[PDB]
């Protein structure tokens, strides 16, 4: 009569690596590395993202005429740009501190777009219908939806001084522009005054702008330039615009609601009616594993990204059938 | 392995023992068959579960981490940002891979140890009532029925009740 001591063997082909040996075939093992995503953009805890599509952050906030579908949006979980998000500033120039503005928007969960200076009543002594072919819309010349190109009225551009008091209980993002004509004839034709100036002040912001007239290379068939500026108006604070030319006035502003965990990503994937806790530019992840090798850019609650191709932990025995 | 049982003095595994990591094969005249040691297998499962849970819990969740944008005059800051991202990625890839390797080695040694200790406790129970036949097997110097085999498995082998019979047959 005999009795023997032994160990398990099965049909498993799983292999792990150790420090002394590679490709040890073992009876049982567990994968710790997530490599499967759904290939879709999804809601984040039930809240859909904001898809900019053809537009980028600048075209969205300025109101590029190609981005009118984005005007009524109010809340989102994250922001998606695409490789084709090129409709931004249509009249050429510089968006000052644009990257800082994107970083600010990265923590905004919602906002209210509202009329800070109504078109029909804020500028009685100026013309408000200035448009350009650089920002065309359906064939016709047009302009940004949130700004207003103030021009001379009846051969005169009076000194203007308009103010707004933030009664929103929230930070108010205010954007404006400064126009720099290519020659002094256009400067006089548009604003009459050749030594123009713009001044924008709050309790903690204070800037003066001077037109810089010179002929530039043609960009979108414009030899002039337009610089875009922004500031955050604190609750209860007042913003004052003072000018005698070249001001691209604010018409709509944004009362911002801050949130946590949001961000801006670039993605080629498409929106589905899915929900997730973890979104990457390649797709959503649904996993309890500690590591993933899908993408370093993550939104929500995700596994840690690593460059590894395989993280397999042996749990059973060396398999010797 | 470190303890010389698995792929050692017990050269192969048992595909016929489907219900446990470690166990026994019995051969008496009532027949033959396998008997998984369910309690040692369960304690091993508890230990390995704690190990996997430890790796998973030390790697706490990765909250929102996205890229940043820099203008054309911010190349130094952009390169610093990517140095930071790439250094952290290097370190975490290294940590994950080598943790997995070292713990795999330790796990194989853990199973090796469990098999060696099971063999040793059976030997300690049997003493001279049985002979060592190599390959992890014992041969009784007496008759050992199914209840006697279960006595060996549960740690309740009665050495005196077979001492005389087996030293008769041992000669």
């Amino acid at each position: 009569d005999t009795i023997c001591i032994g160990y398990h063997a099965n049909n498993s082909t799983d292999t792990v690596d150790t420090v002394l040996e590679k490709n040890v075939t073992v009876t049982h093992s567990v994968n710790l590395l997530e490599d499967s995503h759904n290939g879709k953009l999804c809601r984040l805890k039930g809240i859909a993202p904001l898809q900019l599509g053809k537009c980028n952050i600048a075209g969205w906030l300025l109101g590029n005429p190609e981005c009118d579908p984005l005007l009524p949006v109010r809340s989102w979980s994250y922001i998606v740009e695409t490789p084709n998000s090129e409709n931004g500033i249509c009249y050429p120039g510089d968006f000052i501190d644009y990257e800082e503005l994107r970083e600010q928007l990265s923590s905004v969960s919602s906002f209210e777009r509202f009329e800070i200076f109504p078109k029909e009543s804020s500028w009685p002594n100026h013309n408000t219908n200035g448009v350009t072919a650089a920002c065309s819309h359906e064939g016709k010349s047009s302009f940004y939806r949130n700004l207003l190109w103030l021009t001379e009225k009846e051969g005169s551009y009076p000194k203007l001084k308009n103010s707004y008091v933030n009664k929103k209980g929230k930070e108010v993002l205010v954007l404006w522009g400064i126009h720099h004509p290519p020659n002094s004839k256009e400067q006089q034709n548009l604003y009459q005054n050749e030594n123009a100036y713009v001044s924008v002040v709050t309790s903690n912001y204070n800037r003066r702008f001077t037109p810089e007239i010179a002929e530039r290379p043609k960009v979108r068939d414009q030899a002039g330039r337009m610089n875009y500026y922004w500031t955050l108006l604190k609750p209860g604070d007042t913003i004052i615009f003072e000018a005698n030319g070249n001001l691209i006035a604010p018409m709509y502003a944004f009362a911002l609601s801050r949130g946590f965990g949001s961000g801006i990503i670039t993605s080629n994937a498409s929106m589905h009616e899915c929900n997730t806790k973890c979104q990457t530019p390649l797709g959503a992840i649904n996993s309890s594993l500690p590591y993933q090798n899908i993408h370093p850019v993550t939104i929500g609650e995700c596994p840690k990204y690593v460059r590894s191709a395989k993280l397999r932990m042996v749990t059973g025995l060396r398999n010797i059938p | 392995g470190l303890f010389g049982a698995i792929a050692g003095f017990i050269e192969g595994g048992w595909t016929g023992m489907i219900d446990g990591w470690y166990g026994y094969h019995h051969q008496n005249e009532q027949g033959s068959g396998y008997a998984a040691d369910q309690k040692s297998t369960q304690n091993a499962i508890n230990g390995i579960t704690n190990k996997v849970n430890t790796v998973i819990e030390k790697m706490n969740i990765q909250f929102t981490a996205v890229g940043k944008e820099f203008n054309k005059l911010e190349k130094r800051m952009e390169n610093l940002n990517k140095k930071v991202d790439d250094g952290f990625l290097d370190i975490w890839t290294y940590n994950a891979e080598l943790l997995v390797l070292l713990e795999n080695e330790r796990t194989l040694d853990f199973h090796d140890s469990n098999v060696k200790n099971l063999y040793e406790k059976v030997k300690s129970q049997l003493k001279n009532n049985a002979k060592e036949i190599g390959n992890g097997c014992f041969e009784f110097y007496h008759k050992c029925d199914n209840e006697c085999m279960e006595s060996v498995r549960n740690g309740t082998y009665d050495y005196p009740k077979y001492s005389e019979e087996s030293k008769l047959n041992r000669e």
């Binding site: 009876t27 059973g316 | 489907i18 219900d19 990591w21 369910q38 297998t41 390995i48 579960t49």
Partner: peptide, 19 residues
């Protein structure tokens, strides 16, 4: 099938002892 020999919440022993 529906019955398991072991408590294995993480799936560490696969189908071993599973019936």
């Amino acid at each position: 099938x529906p019955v398991s020999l072991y408590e294995d919440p993480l799936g560490v022993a696969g189908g071993m002892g599973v019936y």
